[PDB]
Amino acid sequence: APPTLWSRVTKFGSGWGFWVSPTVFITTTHVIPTSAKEFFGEPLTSIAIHRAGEFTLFRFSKKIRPDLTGMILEEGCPEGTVCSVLIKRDSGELLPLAVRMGAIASMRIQGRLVHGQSGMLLTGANAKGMDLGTIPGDCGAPYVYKRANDWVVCGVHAAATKSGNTVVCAVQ
Amino acid sequence: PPTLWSRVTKFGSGWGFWVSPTVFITTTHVIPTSAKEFFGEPLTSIAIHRAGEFTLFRFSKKIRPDLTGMILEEGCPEGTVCSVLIKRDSGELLPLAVRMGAIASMRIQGRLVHGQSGMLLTGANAKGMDLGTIPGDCGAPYVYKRANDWVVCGVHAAATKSGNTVVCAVQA
Numbered sequence: 001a002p003p004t005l006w007s008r009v010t011k012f013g014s015g016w017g018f019w020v021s022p023t024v025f026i027t028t029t030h031v032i033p034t035s036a037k038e039f040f041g042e043p044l045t046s047i048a049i050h051r052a053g054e055f056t057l058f059r060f061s062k063k064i065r066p067d068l069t070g071m072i073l074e075e076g077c078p079e080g081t082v083c084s085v086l087i088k089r090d091s092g093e094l095l096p097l098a099v100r101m102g103a104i105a106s107m108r109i110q111g112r113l114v115h116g117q118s119g120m121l122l123t124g125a126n127a128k129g130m131d132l133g134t135i136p137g138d139c140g141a142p143y144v145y146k147r148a149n150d151w152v153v154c155g156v157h158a159a160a161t162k163s164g165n166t167v168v169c170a171v172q
Numbered sequence: 173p174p175t176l177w178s179r180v181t182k183f184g185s186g187w188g189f190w191v192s193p194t195v196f197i198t199t200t201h202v203i204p205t206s207a208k209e210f211f212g213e214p215l216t217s218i219a220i221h222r223a224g225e226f227t228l229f230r231f232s233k234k235i236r237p238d239l240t241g242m243i244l245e246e247g248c249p250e251g252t253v254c255s256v257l258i259k260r261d262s263g264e265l266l267p268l269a270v271r272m273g274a275i276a277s278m279r280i281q282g283r284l285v286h287g288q289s290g291m292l293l294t295g296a297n298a299k300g301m302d303l304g305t306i307p308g309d310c311g312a313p314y315v316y317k318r319a320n321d322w323v324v325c326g327v328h329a330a331a332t333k334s335g336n337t338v339v340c341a342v343q344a
């Protein structure tokens with residue numbers, strides 16, 4: 001995946017978030033620290049926060065990441081698109097996990113109710129574990145795919161099944 | 173915290189895999205043709221067992237005492253979904269699901285290669301995404317989980333232009 005998309009993946013609370021532009025940061029709702037009153041040197045009062053279940057978007061009053069260009073964020077992707085989940089793991093290892101996207105679903109994962117775009121990992125037959133699949137620490141990692149020359153981002157990692165074979169992408 | 177990924181090591185024109193502290197396996201054509209020592213050990217003290225495009229090195233001291241011994245078998249049953257553990261010079265880890273078929277002699281881009289046939293499950297073309305293999309990937313290992321155990325069953329030897337068909341070189 002291009003160096004420019006890996007530069008947008010930022011360690012955040014108990015998981016990750018993604019810079020769409022200089023002023024727009026998206027994450028997974030449950031990774032946000034519940035007491036936090038300041039983000040990147042800016043108070044709560046100076047930040048626009050749109051929340052839809054497990055998807056949260058922050059828009060700031062000034063350019064946090066002026067090194068960045070605005071890119072396309074969409075409400076999920078067509079059924080059968082293959083995406084990469086841009087996962088950072090221990091020691092500057094970068095894990096772009098291949099996933100085949102399916103339909104909008106509502107599910108129960110280990111007691112919690114989750115809603116988003118379901119997908120199946122293309123890494124192996126049994127994704128359970130950290131070598132071939134996801135860990136709770138990967139929440140907020142972005143779902144991206146290439147189309148006609150450009151790259152699109154279409155959600156953030158919300159959950160994975162007991163077996164690890166199914167993941168859920170929270171969408172706008 | 174143990175990891176399979178720690179066993180994948182840069183070697184000659186590609187990669188190799190540590191099966192145990194004393195046992196390293198790779199693709200025969202990536203091995204350097206001019207050499208006196210490999211991992212600090214003089215070739216003097218290295219057993220080399222070649223079977224076509226599969227080579228095994230057994231060292232006379234523990235090069236990786238941090239590792240336990242793993243199960244190595246001569247290929248896997250037909251229809252087993254394996255994972256090819258590709259490391260890139262970018263710092264990327266790319267585990268791709270492959271459906272293994274029959275032992276075969278294959279025309280792959282001009283040349284004849286003997287090993288276990290497989291088909292990538294990412295989709296007929298990777299068009300710019302991390303969904304297929306490149307020449308530099310040769311020597312990467314084929315693994316799958318079976319009960320409580322990882323099995324390694326050979327090394328990445330070749331792939332077709334379209335990238336659909338792959339050959340896993342096996343012990344024999």
Ligand SMILES: O=C(CCc1ccccc1)Nc1ccc(O)cc1
Pocket residue numbers: 100121122124125253269293294295296
């Ligand atoms: O669905 C899969 C592979 C699914 C699979 C994964 C693990 C074990 C068994 C099966 N590929 C696909 C990609 C692109 C397409 O267009 C169609 C299919």
